[PDB]
C-alpha cells in the first residue's frame, strides 16, 4: 500500500544522477552511468539509510532527457528490490507533463515523487494548492514529497499552503529548508513528515521530538556514516535526555558545510546548485557524480574550491564516524 | 536563406495559442483550437503585419504538450505559406530539449525561435552565453529571437550579454522590455534588431531611427489597426520630422494599457501573465484565446477586471484607427 | 556597573512612545504623553517584567525629535528608579550622531541602547562590525542590544557578524527575529543573550535551554499576563521536562498574531510597522499608544482591521492568563 | 523669488562635501574643508555650469553633523553670490526634521532642497505624496528637487507619484535615474523638469527635445568640460538635426563610466556609493573630495580600482573637450 508519514523515519539521502564523461556535451544522448547508480544504491542500503530521494536540483531533474530518467529509475528500482522506499522527481513546466512522468515512474516502481512547482510563471497560493491536488487526483497511488525550494521554484511555500497540503492524503513528507517557521508548520499540517536538512535535525528534533523523526542528507553522498550516527545518537538522546553527543555531531556537520556556499549566500549557491554539489561529492571520493549536463556546466573556480573543501571535510567526518559505528 | 536583422521591420505581433473549451482540465489532451489559429494568422497577414511571433509566456509555451506544439506550428506554417516570417518558441528546461524542439519546429517550417533561458536554476552570464551559442551551433539554419524576460527566466540579460550575442550570426532580434539601457545595447550589439514593446516604439524610434524600425505587439490581438497605424505614422515622421501624430497614437496605447498591471506592478502582472493577457484578448473580441492550460488557470477577479478594461480600450482604438486607415 | 548577558533573563517588553492627540501633525512639537509613559512603566514593573526596551521601529525612534527623546527617557528613568534594566534606542543615520545620542541617554540613566545600523546606504559586513566597535569604544559604559531587523536596516546580520559581536564586551544581547540560524549563532557568539520573539521562545528554549532564558515581547503591551505566564511555565518545563503547558501558551500567542501581518507578509507589515503595532495596542485597551508621528500616519483600512483583531485576541489572552496567575 | 521648471536648463552638477584629512575618525567634529568647497564652487561657475546640487548620497547628507551642513551651505551661498541656482539636501528620518533643516538652509540662502524620502520604514505611495506636500506647505519659499533613488530610499517613485508631484508648485525638478518610463512620466507631470543622468541625456533629449533641456552630472567633478560640451552640442543638434557629435560625446561618457559599478551592478554600487564616487573624483585630480565620514569609509580594493579607472577616463575626457571648447 501507499506510504504514509508514519512510515517516514530516520536518514533519507538524496542521490545525484551519476553522469558519464561526455555528459557536459549537448551532443551526448545517454549520459547516465547506470552501473555507478546501482553501486551507490547498494552502498546506501548497506550503510542502513531509511529511504532514498532523487532527481531534485543537483540530481539534475531539469537537464536529463526522458529516456535517461526512465533508465535511471529502472536501475534504481531493480537494485532496491523493495528493500527501502524510493522517491523519484517529476517536477516539470506544467501539470500534464508532471502527471505523465509521475504515472510512468510510479509504474516502473518508485513509491513516490519529490515534487516542486512549475516555475516559468511564479505561482500564487491557490495555483500551487490546485497543482498538488491535481497531481494527487491524477496519480492516487503515488506518495508526494513537497520539494519546498523558493529559489528554484519562486513560490515561497507559506503557512496556509501547508494547512492545505495536510488535507491531501498522498502528501506525506516535505524536503524543508530553514526551520524558522517549523513549530507552526507542524501545527498546521499534522499529517506530514517534515524533513529538515541534516544540519538542522538536532535543533528540529529538540523542538518536537515526537514529530521530527527523519531528515534529508546530501552530505551522506560524501560518506553516510555521519548521517547514520546522527540518527542513532538522536534516538538515544530522546530516550536518555543527554543531547551532548548529538550536538557534537551536528556541530561537526555545520563546520563541514561552512565553505560550501559562495560568500555564505544561499541565493549565490542556488545559481551553482548543481555544479557545487557534484564538485563536493567528487572531492570526497565516496562516489563519482561526474560532470554536469548542459546548460549548468560552468562554475567559477573560487566557488569550486569551497565546495571541494566541504567534500574533504565530510569525507573526514565519514572516516571518524565509521570508527565510532 | 536565413533571416538577418535587415529583414526584420515594422509590426511583429505575438499571437496566443487559442485553446478549446476544456483546456483548463488536466485530463484534456488536444487543447489547441487549430481553426481559430489559422483564422488569426490570415487576419494578421491581411491586416499587413510584417511578422509573427508565438509561444512566449502568454502563448503558453510552458503548458502545451509536444503534440499540441507540432499541430499548432504545422497549422501556422501551412496557413502562412511563406508570406511572412514566423518564429515559434522552444524555451525549455535544458539545452538538449531546446535543440530537439527547435530542430523539429524549424523542419516543420518556422523561420526561427523566440528563445528564453532555462530557469529552474538561475543562469549567470557565461552559462547564458554558452546556451545561445550551443543552440546556434546545433541548429544553424534557425534564426533566434532573444526573449529577454527577467521575471520569467530569472537571468537579467545584462549589457555584456548583448555584446556576446551580436557575435552569433543566428541571433537577429530580441523581444526587449524597458528601453532604459537601449542606447547602449544598440552600440554593444550592432547586428541585432531590438524590438521594443509597441508602447515604447515611439520613444525608441526617436532615439535611434536608423536601428529601431520594428516593434512587438500584444495589443494587436485586440485589433491590429492601432499597431499598423503606429508603424505607418512613424515611417512618415522619420521622413518629415513631424512626430505629433505618432506621439498621439503612442499616448492612446499607453492609456489602453494603464489598467492591465495589478497595482501598476510588473512583477504582480508576471504571476498572472497568461490569464491576464488571455482575459484581455477575450474582452476585446477580435479573437478567441480561450481558457488557460494548467496550472495557470486561476486569476483574482480584481485583476481580471483591469485586464478586461484594457481589452475594451484596445478594441476602441482598433475601431478608431481602422477608419483612419 | 554594566549589564552582561548573565543579567538578561525572562520577559523583556518593548514599549511604544505614547503620543498626544496632535502627534500626527508636523506642526506639533511636544508629542510625547509623559504621564502615560510613566503609567506604562509602573504597570510593567508591577506585572513583574524583567526589563524594558524602547525606541525601536514602532517606538518611533525615527520620528521623535531630540527633545521628545530626552523627556521620554528622563521620565522612564525617574519612574524606574533603578528597579529594572532599561534600554533606549539611538539608531541614526551615522556613527557620530549615534554616539552623541547614546552618550546623553546613558548619562540621563538608561543602562544601554537597542541599536540598529545606519540604513541610507546599505552596510556590508566590515562596515557594520566597525560601526558597533566604534560605538562601544566611544561609549564604554553603555550596554548594547543589537536590533537585528533586515527590513528596517537593509543589512542582513549574517553569521560572521555574530562571531564579531561576541568579541565586543559591551554587546550583551540581540533583538532577534526568525530562529532558523539560532543554533549556529549561539555557537558563534557565546557572550550574547539572544532574545527570540515571544512566539518563538518556546521553540528556542527547547533548542538550547541553558542559553535561551529570555525573550522580547510586543504583545505584552496588550496585557503582559501572557508573557509572564510563558516565562514562568518555561522555567517549570526546563525543570520537570513537561512542556505541554508552555506549548499551549505559545500556540495561543501564535493564533493571536495570526491576523497582524497584511497577507501573511513580513515585508508588507514592515511598510506599516508603526501604524499596525499602535493600532493593535489601541484596540487591546491596556495602554493608549496614540497616533503616529509623520510621515508614517497612513495605513490601509484592510490592514488596520487585522491589527485590531490581533489586539483583541491578545487582550483576551491577558484576561485568561491573569486568572491563572 | 522661487525657481520654476522654466528656469532649470543645461548642466547641473552635483558636488561632494569636501572632507578634511581626519574625517574618517568618529572623534573629528569639523570635517568640512570650507576652502576647497569655495574653490570648487567658483571653478564650476567659471566652467559655465547652470546650477549646483549638493548633499545627496555621495555628498554625505547622511554622515554630516548639523553644524557641518550649515557651514558648508553658508560657504557655498557666500561664494555663489546669487550667480547660479543652488540646491542643498535635507533628507532625514522624519518630516519634522526635514522641515527644520529645510527652513534653516533656505534662510541661509539656498534656493531649494534635493529631497529623498525617510527610509527607516519603507514608504507607500500615499505616505510619500503626503510627505512632499507637508514640506511644501511648511516651507513654501523652497523649490524642491525629488531625489528619486529607490536603492537609497526604498520607495520606487512610481508613475502615479509623479502625477501627484506635478500638482505641487514647489516641486520643479527631479534627479532621475533610468529613462525607461520617462516618456510617460513627462506626460503625467507637465510642470517638472526631469533631469536624466548625463549619460542618458542624449537619448532623453531626442525623445522629447522640448521638455528635456537639462541633466545632472557627477562626472563634472572630474573636469566639467565634457558636460559643458554635451550641453552645447545638444543645443546645436536640436536646431540643426545633426546628432552625430552629441552621440560621440555621449558614447565617450558611457565608456568612462563603464568600470565604475562593481560587476556592472547598480545595487552593489549603491552599497559603496559614497566611497566609490569620492575615490573616482580623487583619482581624476580636478578636486580633492577627501576621506569618507563614518560609517561608510570601507570599500573593497577591487572596486576602488574600477572607480579610479573611471576617474582617469573622465579626466582624459576633460582634457580632450577643454581643447574643443576653445
TrEMBL record, chain D:
One GO BP annotation of this record: naphthalene catabolic process
Pathway listed: Aromatic compound metabolism; naphthalene degradation
EC number: 4.1.2.45
Binding-site residues, pyruvate: 147, 149, 175, 273
Keywords in alphabetical order: Aromatic hydrocarbons catabolism, Lyase, Plasmid, Pyruvate
Pfam annotation, one family: DHDPS
Residues in the signal sequence: none
Origin: domain of life: Bacteria
Enzyme class: lyase
Residue ranges of coiled coil: none
Reaction equation(s) it catalyzes: (3E)-4-(2-hydroxyphenyl)-2-oxobut-3-enoate + H2O = salicylaldehyde + pyruvate
Molecular function GO labels: 4-hydroxy-tetrahydrodipicolinate synthase activity; aldehyde-lyase activity; trans-o-hydroxybenzylidenepyruvate hydratase-aldolase activity
InterPro entries attached to this UniProt entry: Aldolase_TIM, DapA-like, HBPHA/CBPHA
Assigned protein family: Belongs to the DapA family.
PANTHER family: 4-HYDROXY-2-OXOGLUTARATE ALDOLASE, MITOCHONDRIAL, DIHYDRODIPICOLINATE SYNTHASE
This protein's name: Trans-O-hydroxybenzylidenepyruvate hydratase-aldolase
Lineage per the UniProt record: Bacteria, Pseudomonadati, Pseudomonadota, Gammaproteobacteria, Pseudomonadales
